[PDB]
Design an enzyme around this catalytic site. Structure first.
Site: not given
Ligand SMILES: OC[C@H]1O[C@@H](O[C@@H]2[C@H](O)[C@@H](O)[C@H](O)O[C@@H]2CO)[C@H](O)[C@@H](O)[C@H]1O
Ligand SMILES: [Ca+2]
Ligand SMILES: OC[C@H]1O[C@@H](O[C@@H]2[C@H](O)[C@@H](O)[C@H](O[C@@H]3[C@H](O)[C@@H](O)[C@H](O)O[C@@H]3CO)O[C@@H]2CO)[C@H](O)[C@@H](O)[C@H]1O
Length: 386
Positions: A155, A253, A360
């Site tokens: 990511e 994922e 979980d």
């Molecule tokens: O680890 C959790 C989750 O984070 C997402 O990204 C978030 C948020 O949704 C975005 O808009 C922002 O730019 O960045 C945060 C990270 O703190 C990500 O899109 C998901 O795939 C997960 O990684």
């Molecule tokens: Ca929990």
């Protein structure tokens, strides 16, 4: 009673994977898994029987403090990656090595350089990244692990190993790719991004990767329905990358809630007010969600190669009412998403939220280690329910 509508156009070699990186910390914490019949059984065997054909494992360089206290989140290092890889190959499943190139969680907001690379100039960090990847892969090959793909970063929407400049990130991507290419020509090189719902993001990223000559085969994407928009958009943005740059695409994922209950006393990530929940929070709801992403990626055509369900077995070490007893286990075995020992590396996030499992209720196994009916989704997408 589980129902699954056949996925139309699904290729026979479609990648059906799972990321169970937390499996080692959990087993050491006393957690056990079972099969349909209800007899203790190696989760990897149950996964194989369920039709899974791929395993993804996250790898942190050094997820421990100076004394050796694990940061938690599974304490996933090269060592556990080998343990997992061996059991994956032993059960006829290819491995996807996911290098975060950091000592802890790597995501859109966190892409911290490993402690060892803390103060290396760019040139030396790059060669260190290349070297690390090279040695890690070789240690896995030596262990007889069947490696089918490598994720150079996790990511990396805005950074990698402490770097935020895309010209530098690209060089890091190539340093990683280089190692993979030298290791085995048949290994697919994947880059992983998220937030596909953001207007123009993936188009911008792909073009940038192209303008910097990054050598990769798969453009991977996270896809959590709670925040990442429609399936229509996912298919659209991935197809665009596929057709324009000739890359393969996949979901690295994905997951969904099968229950609103918190199994271990440590607040879960979902469900929550504000999140988009197009499927009922049930076992069937969960199955439909998985089936739908598989459909979405398959709809890309030639280029859509697969879907990995993220952490389908990060179940509780104990009931929610034994919260205090659970904390002890999470602290000692890092079987939770993070331990207090990670505060030194990530004071902002892990520093104040450390504890148990936050997913979980998104496992494909119940709180006691028994497989849920939804685990059958991997087999049923090919034929549909009878
Ligand atoms: O680890 C959790 C989750 O984070 C997402 O990204 C978030 C948020 O949704 C975005 O808009 C922002 O730019 O960045 C945060 C990270 O703190 C990500 O899109 C998901 O795939 C997960 O990684
Ligand atoms: Ca929990
Ligand atoms: O426990 C309830 C609360 O959880 C918070 O989430 C915490 C961290 O803020 C979050 O970053 C972390 O996520 C982990 C990792 O950083 C992320 O990249 C990965 O995708 O998932 C990991 C957890 O599975 O999770 C912890 C959990 O406490 C929420 O921010 C808070 O609102 C509340 O839900």
């Amino acid at each position: 009673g589980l129902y699954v509508e056949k996925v139309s156009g699904l290729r026979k070699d479609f990648i059906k994977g799972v990321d169970v990186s937390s499996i080692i910390a959990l087993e050491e914490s006393g957690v056990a898994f079972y099969n349909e019949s209800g007899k203790k059984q190696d989760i990897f065997k149950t996964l194989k029987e369920a039709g899974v054909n791929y395993v993804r494992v996250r790898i942190w360089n050094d997820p421990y403090d100076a004394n050796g206290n694990g940061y938690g989140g599974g304490n996933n290092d090269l060592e556990k990656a080998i343990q997992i890889g061996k059991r994956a190959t032993a059960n006829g499943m290819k491995l996807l090595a996911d290098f975060h190139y950091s000592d802890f969680w790597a995501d859109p907001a966190k892409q911290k350089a490993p402690k060892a690379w803390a103060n290396l100039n760019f040139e030396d960090k790059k060669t260190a990244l290349y070297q690390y990847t090279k040695q890690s892969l070789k240690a896995m090959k030596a262990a007889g692990i069947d490696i089918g793909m490598v994720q150079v970063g996790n990511e990396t929407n805005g950074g990698l190993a402490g770097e935020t400049d895309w010209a530098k990130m690209s060089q890091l991507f190539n340093a990683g790719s280089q190692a993979v290419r030298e290791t085995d020509s048949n290994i697919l090189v994947a880059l992983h991004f998220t937030n596909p719902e953001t207007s123009g993001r993936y188009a911008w990223i792909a073009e940038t990767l192209h303008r910097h000559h990054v050598d990769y085969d798969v453009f991977a994407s996270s896809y959590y329905p709670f925040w990442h928009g429609t399936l229509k958009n996912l298919t659209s943005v991935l197809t665009s990358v596929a057709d324009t740059y000739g890359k393969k695409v996949m979901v690295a994922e994905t997951s969904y809630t099968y229950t609103a209950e918190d199994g271990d006393g440590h607040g879960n990530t979902a469900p929550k007010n504000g999140q988009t929940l197009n499927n009922p929070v049930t076992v069937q709801g969960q199955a439909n969600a998985v089936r739908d992403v598989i459909q979405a990626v398959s709809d890309v055509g030639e280029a859509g190669i697969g879907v990995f369900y993220w952490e389908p077995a990060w179940i509780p070490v104990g009931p929610a009412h034994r919260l205090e007893k659970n904390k002890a286990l999470w602290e000692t075995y890092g079987s939770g998403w993070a331990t207090s020992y990670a505060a030194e590396y990530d004071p902002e996030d892990a520093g104040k939220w450390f504890g148990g499992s936050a997913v979980d209720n998104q496992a494909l196994f119940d709180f006691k280690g028994r497989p849920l009916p939804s685990l059958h989704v991997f087999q049923y997408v090919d034929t549909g329910t009878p």
